[model samples]
Target: KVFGRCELAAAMKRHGLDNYRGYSLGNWVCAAKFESNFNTQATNRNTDGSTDYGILQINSRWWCNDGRTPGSRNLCNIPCSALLSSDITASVNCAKKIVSDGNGMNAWVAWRNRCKGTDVQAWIRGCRL
Candidate 1:
């Protein structure tokens, strides 16, 4: 599913991603925009042979088991396939664990390159919270 801007923001908040680990809701919203463009099936293959999955782009290298990424930590302890669905519960859960285990929002390079130091509020402005 390709979530609309405000819809994704509201969904992320409903899934408990708002202000997680000192990161604002807009941070998550902004990162999602850059990471997956709010598409649930968004996936990217990395040069290291790992794959990023879902809206939050959870990596198979350390967060999920895709039966391909070498030595996958599977920190989230779920199949990579679980992320590529309209329902974002798994994606949001994995993202929380990712942030908790790693370095906050910096875990996602897209956030650093696009969302960091930017006007995150712009992602949520006028969206009915």
Candidate 2:
């Protein structure tokens, strides 16, 4: 499932990556591997059994809740559930927004390292983007 999701994202990238050479499907795959071990259905549980969801391990409760409803728009405000749904292509599009917005994926990388990691550049081999 993980590899399938990664490949799905890669296939999606083939459509638009001419504009972002260094940061393309290959880089996205590398980032997904680095971030979440490539597990699309992976979930982490708290001691009490509350769960984080999907490959990125997003905490759906904290990041997808309104006062009374679980809403991605209310929390992350980015329709993350849509990305996590069964449609892998849609998920890739959401990921692209997250990475391109200069907040989501890059921020995740920075939080782990002092800067974004070398996965993208390594994958691209310093090719023009």
Candidate 3:
């Protein structure tokens, strides 16, 4: 599923991403926009043969168990397939784990490049969030 900008914002907020680890809901929305363009099934294969999964592009290397990434930490202890679903429950939960681990939101390069140190409220501006 490809979410509209506000739709994604509402979804993430519903999953408790608001002010999570000091990152606002808009920040999460902005990260999703830049990471996977709101596409739930999005995946990007890294040069190391690890894959980034779903809307937030959670990495197979350290987060989800994709069974293909060498030495995967499986920190989230979920199948990589869980991140591909439109529900986004697993994705959001794993993202919380990522941030709480001291990586913060910088775990996602798109968040660092586009949302970090910027006013991202516009990403949720019209969503009534």
Candidate 4:
């Protein structure tokens, strides 16, 4: 519960995520909601034995190090636990990298399955700014 959808969009806009890789702010907001409910401390242990990190639900096997989980590619160079903080700088930066590499939000299963091709404008409905 780190943010309501409006506040989440504002933060993401400030982070240069208003429009990214063809996914709009509304889309990202919906993706985050589906992934972690906007809680930075959120972590989901997958049945595959990998974990999803932070607001972005970044995969431990691909992006960040959890130490306990060996064989992480650790492309972000930040610890997996670091992503679980209220501060989302690292997580946002890494998510941008993921999209920039041509996957867009397709890298996130929630976005692929839920946010894509759906009406998600409700994700940013009432923010003044």
Candidate 5:
């Protein structure tokens, strides 16, 4: 339940983000907007039973420790609940790892389908950050 105050666009400005670090700020922001609408607690069950978690909708198949779905690479080695935090630290760290690993933001289906090679300005258009 820790979201809304710390905007991703603003935060990334100070630190870093997924492989998309060099892209327009809206690229990642827009992907999150479409994936979870900024709801850090957002989770969705996939057709294969894996779940998508957090603003990035990171998959349980490889990111989190949700035992309901086993055999995950558990790349981030964190509980899915950590992704639910309003604070972006954990998610930001994991996201960077994901991108650095090679998949880039392409690991995010939402980014691939919507925010990839797409206009991101609208996502941060009105934000103060």
Candidate 6:
């Protein structure tokens, strides 16, 4: 399961992230847990024969733009995946940027609110990018 707290925290510390904390981390954990069950090795299949991999469930076809072959980058350089890989901070940072760079927790809370009580699969519906 994709327990975002420990894993995300590890990723953040690894990447030197400092701007997020408290409810932000909590909320992100909630979202990530809902997304991928806190499984760092998680993967899902797509209709196009591609796959979404890792804790953030990043799509290999789209995010691996580093041209280092499929699943090369720990995180997806495409967007969300990058957050799981080399740019763990950047993943949450990108989420924050969605609403004009709002606070990180707010972004995660918004995401949770938007998908709360819905099926986990539905929450990440268009997150393929």
RMSD of each: 0.9, 5.7, 0.9, 1.3, 2.4, 9.7
Predict model 2's lDDT versus the native: 0.49
Which lDDT tens digits does candidate 2 get at residues 69-114?
3332434554445545544554454444555655555535522463
Per-residue lDDT value at 44 in model 2: 60
- Cα lDDT of model 1 overall? 0.91
Compute each candidate's TM-score over C-alphas: 0.96, 0.52, 0.96, 0.92, 0.84, 0.42
Worst 10 residues of 1 by lDDT: 96-105
Model 4 pairs whose backbones collide: none
Name the regions of candidate 2 deviating beyond 4 angstroms: 4-9, 15-22, 45-52, 58-86, 110-115, 119-129
Q: Which candidate is the best by lDDT?
A: 1
Point out the higher-scoring one by TM-score: 5 or 6: 5
- lDDT tens readout by residue for model 4, 94-123: 998888877767899989999888888877
Count of clashes, each model: 0, 0, 0, 0, 2, 13
Query: Lowest summed lDDT over 10 consecutive residues: which window, candidate 5?
Result: 12-21
The collision pairs in model 3 are none
Candidate 4 Cα lDDT to native:
0.84
Q: Which stretches of candidate 5 lie over 4 Å from their true place?
A: 1-6, 18-21
lDDT of 4 at 62: 82
Model 2, residue pairs in steric clash: none
Candidates' C-alpha lDDT: 0.91, 0.49, 0.90, 0.84, 0.78, 0.46
Residues 1-129, model 3: lDDT tens digits: 999998788788888999988887888888999999999999999999999999999999899898888777898999999999979999998989999997788788988988898989878886766
For residue 109, model 3's alpha carbon misses the true position, in angstroms, by 0.5
